[PDB]
């Protein structure tokens, strides 16, 4: 099957500016290339077909070009509704079709360092035999961040999970939670609980911590 490779994986562009997304085919496909937009929770929708032709409702700021093995989708002035994932699809010899792996187009804004908060496990939870410790990174940009948990100065690995929000529609920031899960027995045998946050907006990493029982 013909392999479709999109780049970049994530494109960050400011509203009102131009975005150019790329898609490469492993074999020539002439102009037999479509592009779809997909927003979170929603079905994909056809935007461009035969490499350069817009579907009927599609605004003129969207265009496509290319033939053979290299193709682009350009959005000449970005509107808020345009930030989404875009997939390319080849159909050189239908029914043999394949999709690219997608490019996420997100909103570029000024860097915002996270506000960081740590939460100890509740006494009620501890009755259950498990302790959850939560670290919140609030309203930051860009999305990339590193969170490290330390318990009595030992770096924890393998016992945490993260969740991140979609980009906020008003301020274009993200928030992220990291949850450390430990047994009650382990929680009660250690004292200092810390989450260290590294982000390009912070000159040095920020650590928030608590001492169990204080």
């Amino acid at each position: 099957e013909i392999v479709m490779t999109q780049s970049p994986a994530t494109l960050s562009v400011s509203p009102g500016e131009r975005a150019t997304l790329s898609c490469r085919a492993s074999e020539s496909i002439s102009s037999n290339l479509a592009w779809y937009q997909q927003k979170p929770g929603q079905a994909p929708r056809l935007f461009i077909y035969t490499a350069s032709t817009r579907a009927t409702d599609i605004p003129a700021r969207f265009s496509g070009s290319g033939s053979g093995t290299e193709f682009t989708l350009t959005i000449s002035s970005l509107q808020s509704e345009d930030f989404a994932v875009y997939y390319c699809q080849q159909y050189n010899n239908w029914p043999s079709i394949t999709f690219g792996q997608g490019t996420r187009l997100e909103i570029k804004r000024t860097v915002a360092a996270p506000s960081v908060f740590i939460f100890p496990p509740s006494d009620e939870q501890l009755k259950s035999g498990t302790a959850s410790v939560v670290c919140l990174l609030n309203n930051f940009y860009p999305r990339e961040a590193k969170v490290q948990w330390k318990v009595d100065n030992a770096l924890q690995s393998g016992n945490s999970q993260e969740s991140v929000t979609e980009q906020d529609s008003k301020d274009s920031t993200y928030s992220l939670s990291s949850t450390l899960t430990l047994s009650k027995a382990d929680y009660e045998k250690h004292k200092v609980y810390a989450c260290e946050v590294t982000h390009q907006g912070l000159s040095s990493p920020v650590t928030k911590s608590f001492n169990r029982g204080e």
Binding site: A43, P44, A55, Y87, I97, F117, F119, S122, E124, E162
Partner: protein
């Protein structure tokens, strides 16, 4: 109106069979191919196969050939996707889509809304709700964070509001994570003025309809 309407959300156990459907309306269903597309959680689109409902001719992707059955009942203007024995790895959103003919040839010109399929050994379970209490070190005249941890439920979803819907600004309810136990967990947080901690009540309202579990948690400083 030209549309494809898919069947509802499914939650199944490994080894169970499953048939989901895609009904066309507003056009001549027997004149166009339908395709099925899989989208695993956090992943891209994968083509599974095509069927021509007018005669049930099928063209499967090599990846899915022999793994799923695509069928059609033209008397019902409906295409189907079927598994005889589900695996947890079949957890995904499934889309059906019409293949263009004449207009937009060979593209997917009309999409169904998707059918979410979750396959897990887990059983329905309501969450436990715990406070994420505002820190005693919260900056005076500044901003404090507080929240609720909604732990150990299945299947999705849970809904969370704050103060019965009266508090919305500053709220972040995170996407759920699937834990290694097979149960989901999420937190909902909000930032508020530190000066409000003594005077304003903060209650998260949690509902897990699948288990009919409804909880209100008051969150306050220790």
């Amino acid at each position: 109106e030209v549309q494809l309407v898919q069947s509802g959300t499914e939650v199944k156990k490994p080894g169970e069979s499953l048939k989901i459907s895609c009904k066309g309306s507003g056009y001549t269903v027997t004149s166009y191919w339908i395709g099925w597309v899989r989208q695993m959680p956090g992943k891209g689109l994968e083509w599974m196969g095509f069927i021509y409902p007018g005669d049930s001719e099928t063209r499967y992707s090599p990846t899915f050939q022999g793994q799923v059955t695509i069928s059609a009942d033209k008397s019902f203007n409906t295409a189907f996707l079927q598994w005889s024995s589900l695996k947890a790895s079949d957890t995904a959103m499934y889309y059906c889509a019409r293949v263009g003919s004449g207009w937009y040839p060979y593209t997917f010109d009309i999409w169904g809304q998707g059918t979410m399929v979750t396959v897990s050994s887990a059983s329905t379970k309501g969450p436990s709700v715990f406070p994420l209490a505002p820190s005693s070190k919260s900056t005076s005249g500044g901003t404090a964070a507080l929240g609720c941890l909604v732990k150990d439920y299945f299947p999705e979803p849970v809904t969370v509001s704050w103060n019965s819907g009266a508090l919305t600004s500053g709220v972040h309810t995170f996407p759920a994570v699937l834990q290694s136990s097979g149960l989901y967990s999420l937190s909902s947080v909000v930032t508020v003025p530190s000066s409000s901690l003594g005077t304003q009540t903060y209650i998260c309202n949690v509902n897990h309809k699948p288990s009919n579990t409804k909880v209100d948690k008051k969150v306050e400083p220790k």
